Amino acid sequence: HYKTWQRNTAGYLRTFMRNKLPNNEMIGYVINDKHPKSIRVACDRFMYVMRYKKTFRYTKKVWAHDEESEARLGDVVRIQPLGYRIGPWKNYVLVRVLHKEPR
Amino acid sequence: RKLRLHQERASRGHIEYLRQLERPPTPSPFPLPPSPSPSSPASAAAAKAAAFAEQAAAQTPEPSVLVRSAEEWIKRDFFFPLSHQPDTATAGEAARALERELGLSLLQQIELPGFGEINVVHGDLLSGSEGNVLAADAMLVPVPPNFLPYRGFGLEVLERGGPALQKAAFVEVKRKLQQREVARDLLSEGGLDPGDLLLTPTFGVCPRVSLLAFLVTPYYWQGNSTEAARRLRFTMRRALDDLNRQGPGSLLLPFVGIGLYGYEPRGAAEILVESAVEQLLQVDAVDPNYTLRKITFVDRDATNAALLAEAAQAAKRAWLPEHQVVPAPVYWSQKQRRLLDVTDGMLMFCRKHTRLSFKKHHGVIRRQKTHYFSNVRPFLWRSSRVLEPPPLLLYRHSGKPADWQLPARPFYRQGVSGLLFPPRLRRGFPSMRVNSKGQFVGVNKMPYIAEKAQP
Amino acid sequence: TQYILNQLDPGGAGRNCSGIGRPDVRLPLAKPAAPSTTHLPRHLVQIARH
Amino acid sequence: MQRACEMVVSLLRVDALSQRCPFHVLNVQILDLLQREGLIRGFKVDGTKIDILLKHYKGAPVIRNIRVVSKPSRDIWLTPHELKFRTRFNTGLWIMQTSCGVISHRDCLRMGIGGKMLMAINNGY
Amino acid sequence: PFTLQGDCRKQILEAVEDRLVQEALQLELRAALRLLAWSTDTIDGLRSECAGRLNPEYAYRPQWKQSQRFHKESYLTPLQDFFPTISSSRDAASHRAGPHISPSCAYFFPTPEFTVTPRTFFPLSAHPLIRRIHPDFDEETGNDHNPYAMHKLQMQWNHSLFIQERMQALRHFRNV
Amino acid sequence: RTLANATGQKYDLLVAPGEHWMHWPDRWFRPISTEYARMLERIKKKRPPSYRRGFRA
Amino acid sequence: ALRQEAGEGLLKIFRDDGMAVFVKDTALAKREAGRAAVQSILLACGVA
Amino acid sequence: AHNPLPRRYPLYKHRTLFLPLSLPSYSPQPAISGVAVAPLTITTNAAQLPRTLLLQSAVRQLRPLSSSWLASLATS
Amino acid sequence: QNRFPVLNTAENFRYWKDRGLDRLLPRVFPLKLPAHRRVDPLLREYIFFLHSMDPARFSIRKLGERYGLKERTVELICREFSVAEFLRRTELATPYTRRVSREKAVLRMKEALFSLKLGYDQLGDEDLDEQEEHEFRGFRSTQDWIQRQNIEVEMMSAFPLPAKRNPLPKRVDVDVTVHNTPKLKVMNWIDPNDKVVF
RNA sequence: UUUUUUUUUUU
RNA sequence: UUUUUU
RNA sequence: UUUU
RNA sequence: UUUUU
RNA sequence: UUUUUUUU
């Protein structure tokens, strides 16, 4: 939790903007594409510390869904959240693929 | 006119306060970037682009905070400069529309039955070619000598008339000057004295003017402000007095004090207005000789005209019984009057033994936190420091509130009342937000107790 | 000359000035000199001389 | 970014006339701002290194104190309304890195944009 | 100079020098524009010297032209660009029938004659407190400079604006 | 102030006074002495006086 | 501004730098004289 | 939650109230009706000066309501 | 080193001040006294009379111009005079035996001593209106509270320099009176931050 | 520590 | 209860 | 209560 | 508590 | 000039 005066500093606002995306979108790279029509997207987030005034990074691995199964391992993609639960692990939907690794 | 409903009067004060805080913009010009900049190419390109951003920054008012998302705002602050016309700078269209209906969007007339006909303050051109373009005695305010160096209303008048008018002016002054010398020599400051008058028939200056008086006026740089005001009153009174037993009663004094001798629309204005009324009534006269029953003021300047009107209002007060205001707290006290008889024995406890008095307990606080949460927080229900407003002024005879009264009394912390980087407050749409469709919808949340205390 | 006098004594419209340096003022000059008749108009003086 | 912080050691010398400095794109832009204020007599890119002259007055140099705020391991950012509180009642020179190039602290407040405090020149506490 | 007598003499030299330079420059420009529009032999001379700089072998001596008598007065005639012509062509551009200037030259320089501008001698400022100290500071506006006058001065001294104008003319000459 | 201004060659003025250390009026060019023996020679060479910008002169 | 001078039929309008912009030597002649003066001052004062 | 008062020898002396007032705007303002309203000095007391009283008086009166490029410049 | 013959320079600021070892030296200073008490008591009666006679002809401002008195100072003369006379006519108590704080008692002694040495003033000597002048009034006068800076730094150049950012007025809440009755007082709360006027 | 005031930077 | 004192 |  | 010496 | 300096 952040105090009222902690929500107006440039350090916190800058971190917020980086994390914040349209439709709560995220950026990550796929690390597992073994199961059919399934890909695990590894997203990286950021956080601010009001004590030492330094920002660190922590990975957030999540599961996604692909229709055409165009994405492959080691390919940065875009994910979008959803207001339901489908499958045991599936919690995201693909939109597009930015980069493609050769084979 | 004559707002009788309480709601109409309440809204009048709101517009007055907002108008004072509103200030029109003043975009400043920006110099062109220099082409032969000695800086490196990397810095030269950045500097050239930044110049254009500043130009549009001060010429692009921003919309309401609620329009765009929070995220958008943060990115814009770090990508573009800050505009000079924030949404919380000028009033919206709602304020302008209200003034149209309330009636806030010939100036004054002081009428006295029996003494003075009318006192119209209509402002317009004098020699442009009825209210303000028919009289028989025109006024003039030349320099102490008979030669105007520059400026002055009379400079134009004299030149317009040509040599025909000028010849008559120099003859009249010559005879008057000689008479003073002989009169002051046979019976026993060789220059003129402020307060003299000279008559000059019109020579085609204005078809609708018969006479043209020449009243000298003093300077303002001599002495302090207190002495300058005293000098102007003496000239005014003498001028008016002489005019009385001169001819028909029709005064067309445009504006005295204006020109190049130093003028003050605030102070000088009150002198003139206040002087006019006395002439009409002829207070300072043992033998009343009602000759002068028409006084008017003419001003070309719009700004000045407006100001003049204000003075008129003040003049009307404290003179006519129909416009005598009185504070409400004292008005009611004066109505329920009683005669109380106090005997000698009733003042026994009033007297005291000690002669002097002073505070016997220092106001030094012991506990800053314990006292604050016991006798400060409970007694504070607002997030802003507001002082007691002034009392309401009511009439004496009718006993109804008047239109013009004292203004608001805004308070500022430490005296400073200037903000360079005002934030985007959320108070523009209380309990209202924008939906996905674009419509206006309400909210259900507890308001912040320190919303106004966190600018 | 006008600028130098302004700094030494602030004076203009709506302000009480000392009147030092103005054409219409007497000063204790070291030697006699004629008044400053340059600011007077030429049309009114010529017609008034006759 | 690392090479930027290496310029303070070379420019902060008393008994010297000219000192070398590694060549960098960002370093070239910084020297331009300092020369405008009259802190550096001049500089020249000698290829792999930049030769920067030193200014002196009555023995003592014009530069007496250098403070590095920004570091490669982190990033200091201040809002337009917060920079004024930090910088007040002082004659110091703060290098601000805004989106529209590099400018001093005085110009950053004029535009009202959020800059980045890089280094301090002639600064006290 | 140090003495009063010596200091006064310096004023005389400065007064005559300031007037002579103004007249010399004014007449110098008059002969420069007319020569370039009438003398046709100047084209050969310019190319001969330009080509000879690289090597003497490319330098050639042109024939110039046969000497002819002249009035030696037409090259020093005043020239003006004024619209009023109700007096039977009072000015009519440079001379009565001399070469004319382009319409685009009526923006920066209203007249072709070389005049003198009243350049300031003190620095400008933006703070109200500092503007009161500038000598040229009128109280009727609160500013120490005229924005309209200074706007045109900056445009004249601008290399970026001149490059665009020069490039446009070059393309027209090459194409047609 | 006198130290920084000399090397900084930039506005280094205070708030109360106005341009006290930087303002250097030309006291050896404008107030130059002039004698009546040589004044008549410069009247026909200098620009004639045709201006209106000074009243207190 | 306006400056008086010996009456000789002269009417000249000078600029700030000391350069004249309009030099003067049934009712058509009178109107033309004033028309040239209004446009002359605006030519060297207007900014497009 | 405090009542300041003197607690020293100087217990009875003139204590005038001071209200600091900096410049309202740094832009150059023109003269209103010929009367200059520019700021002369930064030191301002609580009492309003007559020069400033004119500007504020007029403020309330104002109502809220209301080819080549070089060749083209000369042509227009 | 520089020429600046004026009375608003850094060294000329706060003239006749101890700068050095003379700060600790004891020095006597004149004792201040309000203007409304230095005037002749006789004239106070006269002034009061006029005011109470005809407020219209003898307004608060016009009356103070003849005698050279400020609008605020003249108001106190009538108020202080009224109470003194009221207790005498009604035979309530004498002015000397009147109860008052110690701050006024010392003031009365100074007023009597001021006249015993010099004498009462027949006419006031003060300006009705203020004048913008360079003077030292406290420590809050020579400071900029908007930008919070003491030293202004600007670029030196002959060409026009871009102007600075102008400040905006501070919007604060105020109160006004609409209806006033003996048994109730209604007031309205104004919020300038509200976009909708209604 | 304000007579007629419930107003007052009282000091 | 005395002394001083526009 | 030198305002219960 | 008492109260014009 | 008032039981003023003077003090439950």
Q: What is the DSSP string of I75-125?
A: HHHHHHHHHHHHHHHTT---STT----HHHHHHHHHHHHHHHHT--BSS--
CB contact under 8 A, C12 and E139: yes
Cβ contact A77:A43 at 8 Å: no
- Give the sheet arrangement for strand D102-104, strand by strand: D66-68, D117-121, D93-97, D102-104
What is the bridge-based pairing of β-strands B433-434 and B440-441? antiparallel
Single-letter amino acid, residue B307: L
How many other CB atoms are there within 10 angstroms of residue G43's CB atom? 13
- Pseudo-torsion of CA A58, A64, A70, A71, nearest 10°? 10
What is the bridge-based pairing of β-strands D66-68 and D43-45? unpaired
What 3-state DSSP class applies to B103? coil
Given a contact as 3+ CB pairs under 8 Å, which chains touch A? B, D
What is the bridge-based pairing of β-strands A26-32 and A38-49? antiparallel
CB contact under 8 A, E151 and G47: yes
Cβ contact I176:F48 at 8 Å: no
CB of I109 nearer than 7 A to strand K = no
CB contact set of A102 (below 8 Å; sequence gap of 6+): none
Using CA atoms, how far residue E153 sits from A84, E108, E124, in Å, is 68, 8, 15
CB-to-strand K under 7 Å, chain I 135-194 = none
Nearest to A63 by CA among A89, A44, A83: A89
User: Residue A55: closest CA among chain D residues belongs to which residue?
Assistant: D74
What is d(CA B347, CA F37) in angstroms, rounded to the nearest whole number?
A: 95
**Which residues in chain F have their CB less than 8 angstroms from residue I10's CB?**
14, 16-17, 20-21
User: Residue H73: closest CA among chain G residues belongs to which residue?
Assistant: G48
Report the residue of F47, F50, F55 to disrupt the G interface, i.e. the one with the largest count of G CBs within 10 Å: F50
The length of chain A, given as a count of residues:
103
**Distance in Å, residue B291 CA to nucleotide J5 C1':** 45
Report the residue of D34, D113, D117 to disrupt the B interface, i.e. the one with the largest count of B CBs within 10 Å: D113
Chain K bases closer than 7 angstroms to a protein Cβ: 6
What is d(CA B62, CA B57) in angstroms, rounded to the nearest whole number?
A: 10
Nearest to B280 by CA among B112, B113, B116: B116
CB-to-strand J under 7 Å, chain I 166-185 = 182, 185
Method: cryo-EM
How many other CB atoms are there within 10 angstroms of residue B390's CB atom? 15
Using CA atoms, how far residue E55 sits from B15, E44, E50, E134, in Å, is 85, 17, 10, 57
Looking at the partner chain, which of I2, I143, I150 has a beta carbon nearest the beta carbon of F21?
I2
Instruction: Kindly report the three-state secondary structure assignment for every residue of chain H.
Output: CCCCCCCCCCCCCCCCCCCCCCCCCCCCCCCECCECCCCCCCCCCCCCCHHHHHHHHHHHHCCCCCCCHHHHHHHC
Per-residue tokens: B92? 């919206």
A-B interface (Cβ pairs under 8 Å ≥ 3): yes
Long-range contacts of F48-51 (CB under 8 A, 24+ apart): F50/G14, F50/G18
H helix or E strand, kind and range, residue E131: helix E128-131
Cβ contact E72:G10 at 8 Å: no
To what resolution in angstroms was this structure determined? 3.3
Q: How many helices and strands in chain F, by DSSP H and E?
A: 2, 1
Per-residue tokens: C31? 């030697």
Chain N bases closer than 7 angstroms to a protein Cβ: 2, 4-5, 7-8
CB contact under 8 A, A10 and D73: no
What is d(CA I128, CA I130) in angstroms, rounded to the nearest whole number?
A: 7
CB contact under 8 A, H30 and E106: no
Cβ contact I125:I69 at 8 Å: no
What is d(CA E97, CA E91) in angstroms, rounded to the nearest whole number?
A: 10
How many other CB atoms are there within 10 angstroms of residue I107's CB atom? 15
What is d(CA B395, CA B326) in angstroms, rounded to the nearest whole number?
A: 6
What is d(CA I191, CA I198) in angstroms, rounded to the nearest whole number?
A: 12
I window 137-156, beta carbon within 8 A of D: 147-151, 153, 155
Residue-wise burial string across B263-296, b where 16 or more C-beta atoms lie within 10 A, e elsewhere: bbbbbbbbbbbbbbbebbbbeeeeeeeeebbbbb
Per DSSP, which regions of B3-64 are E strands? none
CB contact under 8 A, G16 and E106: no
CB contact under 8 A, F55 and C1: no
H helix or E strand, kind and range, residue E73: none
Single-letter amino acid, residue B321: P
Per-residue tokens: G35? 């028309």
**Distance in Å, residue I79 CA to nucleotide N6 C1':** 32
Using CA atoms, how far residue H67 sits from E46, E105, E165, H70, in Å, is 29, 15, 10, 9
C1–chain F nearest CA distance, Å: 6
**Distance in Å, residue I99 CA to nucleotide M2 C1':** 23
H18 phi and psi angles, rounded to 5 deg: -115, 130
